[PDB]
């Protein structure tokens, strides 16, 4: 089980990676909209 | 000064003086002059090539200055503008006004306040607009 346990733990770390990537993209889009609004 | 400039046939400069006059008059709790000046300036600037893009903004101010008198005459006012300048419907000001009207129609102060917060978050609000929105909220 140690093999499966450790690999699933790396998978959980990878879930955190995915969450960070998605949140970063969302924040980038929000700042995107802010600047685009500002120029006008 | 605006009278002199108009008498000199130098347009686009008297307009700024009248805009300042209307903006300051709206502060003293006298709204008729502000509404008249704002609507006149907006309709005048509608037809100009360069100034056209700014025209919409003026209307919004009048609407706010028209909201204090009574809510009924504000709703109708919006209609009068939208039919004349259909592109006004595209700007965020129309949506904000409709949402504020819907929130106020049922004493839902919280929805009005939340919409104001969201609009301010997207773009910072001016002191004039902040004060006028606070005054409207009092009702």
């Amino acid at each position: 089980m140690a093999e499966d346990a450790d690999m699933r733990n790396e998978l959980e770390e990878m879930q955190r990676r995915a969450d960070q990537l998605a949140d970063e993209s969302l924040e980038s889009t929000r700042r995107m909209l802010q600047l685009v609004e500002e120029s006008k | 000064s605006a009278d002199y400039y108009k008498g000199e046939e130098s347009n686009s400069s008297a307009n700024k003086c009248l805009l300042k006059v209307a903006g300051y008059a709206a502060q003293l709790e006298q709204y008729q002059k502000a509404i008249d000046i704002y609507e006149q300036v907006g309709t005048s600037a509608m037809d100009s090539p360069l100034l056209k893009y700014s025209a919409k903004d003026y209307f919004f101010k009048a609407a706010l200055c028209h909201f204090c008198i009574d809510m009924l005459n504000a709703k109708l006012a919006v209609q009068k503008y939208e039919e004349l300048f259909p592109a006004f419907s595209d700007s965020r000001e129309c949506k904000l006004m409709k949402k504020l009207l819907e929130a106020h129609e049922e004493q839902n102060v919280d929805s009005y306040t939340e919409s104001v917060k969201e609009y301010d978050s997207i773009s910072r609000l001016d002191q004039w607009l902040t004060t006028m929105l606070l005054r409207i909220k009092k009702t």
Side-chain angles (χ1 to χ4, degrees):
Chain A
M1 168 71 207
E3 315 304 299
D4 193 357
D6 62 56
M7 85 186 307
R8 157 198 292 167
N9 290 9
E10 331 171 29
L11 293 211
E12 297 209 329
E13 169 61 16
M14 202 73 170
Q15 273 85 85
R16 334 179 188 294
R17 150 179 283 254
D19 308 356
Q20 308 142 18
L21 269 284
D23 283 85
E24 208 64 38
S25 149
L26 181 60
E27 285 296 284
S28 298
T29 53
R30 282 207 262 277
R31 168 165 44 262
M32 203 67 227
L33 170 57
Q34 175 163 26
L35 271 158
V36 161
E37 156 42 11
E38 266 186 55
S39 305
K40 213 146 48 156
Chain B
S1 93
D3 168 31
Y4 282 132
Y5 265 133
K6 194 89 74 162
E8 189 42 278
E9 299 80 58
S10 58
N11 300 14
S12 198
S13 164
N15 272 7
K16 98 191 192 63
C17 283
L18 297 199
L19 287 170
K20 297 289 299 319
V21 157
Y24 271 128
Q27 184 49 91
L28 269 60
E29 309 285 86
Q30 40 183 66
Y31 298 65
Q32 185 55 54
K33 192 70 202 321
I35 300 146
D36 170 23
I37 296 290
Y38 279 125
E39 67 182 27
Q40 199 280 331
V41 169
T43 186
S44 183
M46 181 275 268
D47 262 352
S48 149
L50 301 146
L51 278 147
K52 136 176 184 187
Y53 305 105
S54 91
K56 278 164 287 272
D57 317 297
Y58 304 148
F59 291 153
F60 167 81
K61 261 143 178 199
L64 260 179
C65 175
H66 210 337
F67 205 23
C68 277
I69 296 287
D70 62 333
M71 312 325 178
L72 281 168
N73 308 156
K75 216 166 176 310
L76 277 61
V78 160
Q79 262 87 56
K80 169 150 58 142
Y81 296 134
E82 205 166 344
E83 55 212 59
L84 176 54
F85 192 86
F88 186 32
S89 200
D90 82 342
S91 63
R92 316 207 280 147
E93 278 77 342
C94 290
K95 285 87 163 176
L96 165 146
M97 281 265 168
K98 294 173 251 153
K99 183 131 65 176
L100 293 199
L101 272 171
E102 270 176 13
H104 191 51
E105 274 293 346
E106 270 62 44
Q107 303 247 3
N108 188 321
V109 307
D110 316 68
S111 157
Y112 168 106
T113 323
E114 158 273 353
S115 283
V116 165
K117 293 154 201 143
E118 175 273 318
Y119 178 68
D120 183 284
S121 156
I122 282 284
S123 158
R124 315 313 320 294
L125 288 171
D126 181 16
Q127 174 65 2
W128 193 85
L129 291 175
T130 306
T131 286
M132 181 22 50
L133 268 292
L134 169 138
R135 174 131 67 257
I136 281 285
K137 160 173 275 147
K138 269 326 307 172
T139 291

